[PDB]
């Protein structure tokens, strides 16, 4: 059961809308994005007994 999310739009809509706080003018910047999968790899089904 995954969260019903679109990762591209959610990953694009975190970037700040206006947010001039630092230098009192908008700076130049570069942004790279990456997602990550998280699972428990060590929860494996008990494949032994169906063989028997």
């Amino acid at each position: 059961m995954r969260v019903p999310i679109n990762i591209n739009n959610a990953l694009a809509r975190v970037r700040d809308p206006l947010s001039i706080g630092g230098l009192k003018f908008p700076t130049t910047k570069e942004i790279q994005e990456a997602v990550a999968a998280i699972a428990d790899k060590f929860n494996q089904e008990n494949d032994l007994v169906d063989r028997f």
Binding site: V3, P4, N6, N9, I38, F42, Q44, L48, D50, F52
Partner: protein
């Protein structure tokens, strides 16, 4: 005498859930609960395969299968003791294999223990073991005890004062299982899959410190057999079906509209080959061989909860 069991469980989806479901960041139509019910269908399928494997693991583990109202996945509380009548389910070890007294001296001898099990099951030609299926690090218990070290040192000639200085423990465990297999003949299988229980700590399927023993051959110990459930009136009369079923129900016209999926099955494992002259059943046995095996194992990562 033999008699099956029954299993069933349900879902539901109300009107607010079917009508309102959008994606979390995209802006789309009402079409997400269609994709959402398919995961519940697949989850009920895997949820039934887990009870097949659970019943069969329970009969291999304890011989009997025991259901009781304290169980997690039992709301009904149906108490059951289905005693399959395994004669001697466990093998006695008063002092375990990794039990040392004094200064490095061990207590018992594993290779000799399986040797006189084979010898004292001579004229019972069905109690005489063939294979072992042990999961965790088992070579270390063969590598630290006294007698199997003395057998490796007998075989490789490595007397400590004259041939070589002292071999490391790693050189012991890289051949201890092989000399064990050669001096007994029990083909040892390994099965090291794991399940994450509610502690958050990884445990193997074969528990550490225990090994199973098959008693006549490696093969099917009986079978798991389903029985028939109800499917309704193909022509005018009731015609059954046999496997695990899964039923969907539309109530999207009713007040309020809802939607429910129901799956379940009927079945129970059966032990086919019994003894004839006596009514015994010596086909698989357990034994707990050591106590401190987790210290021989690498640690496991925590579950990321983010």
């Amino acid at each position: 005498t033999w008699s099956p069991l029954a299993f069933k469980e349900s879902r539901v989806w109300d009107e607010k859930e079917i009508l309102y479901l959008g994606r979390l960041a995209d802006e789309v139509q009402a079409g997400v609960i269609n994709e959402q019910i398919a995961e519940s269908l697949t989850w009920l399928m895997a949820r039934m395969r887990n009870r097949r494997r659970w019943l069969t693991w329970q009969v291999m583990r304890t011989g009997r299968i025991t259901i009781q109202p304290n169980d997690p996945y039992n709301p009904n509380g149906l108490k059951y003791v289905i005693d399959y009548g395994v004669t001697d389910i466990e093998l006695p070890l008063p002092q375990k294999f990794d039990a040392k007294d004094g200064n490095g001296n061990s207590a018992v001898d594993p290779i000799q223990y399986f040797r006189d099990l084979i010898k004292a099951a001579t004229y019972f030609p069905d109690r005489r073991p063939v294979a072992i299926i042990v999961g965790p690090g088992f070579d270390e218990v063969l590598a630290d005890n006294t007698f199997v070290q003395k057998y490796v040192e007998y075989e490789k000639g490595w007397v400590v004062g004259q041939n070589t200085v002292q071999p490391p423990r790693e050189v012991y465990r890289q051949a201890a299982l092989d000399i064990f297999k050669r001096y007994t003949g029990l083909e040892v299988m390994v099965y090291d899959k794991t399940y994450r229980d509610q502690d958050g700590s990884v445990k193997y399927w074969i528990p550490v410190g225990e090994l199973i023993v098959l008693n006549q051959s490696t093969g099917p110990v009986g079978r798991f057999v389903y029985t028939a459930h109800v499917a309704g009136q193909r022509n005018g009369k009731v015609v059954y079906a046999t496997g695990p079923y899964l039923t969907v129900k539309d109530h999207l016209q009713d007040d309020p509209p809802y939607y429910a999926i129901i799956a379940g099955f009927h079945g129970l494992p059966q032990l086919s080959g019994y003894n004839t002259e006596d009514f015994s059943f010596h086909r698989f046995k357990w034994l707990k061989y050591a106590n401190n095996v987790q210290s021989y194992l690498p640690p496991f990562p925590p579950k990321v909860e983010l």
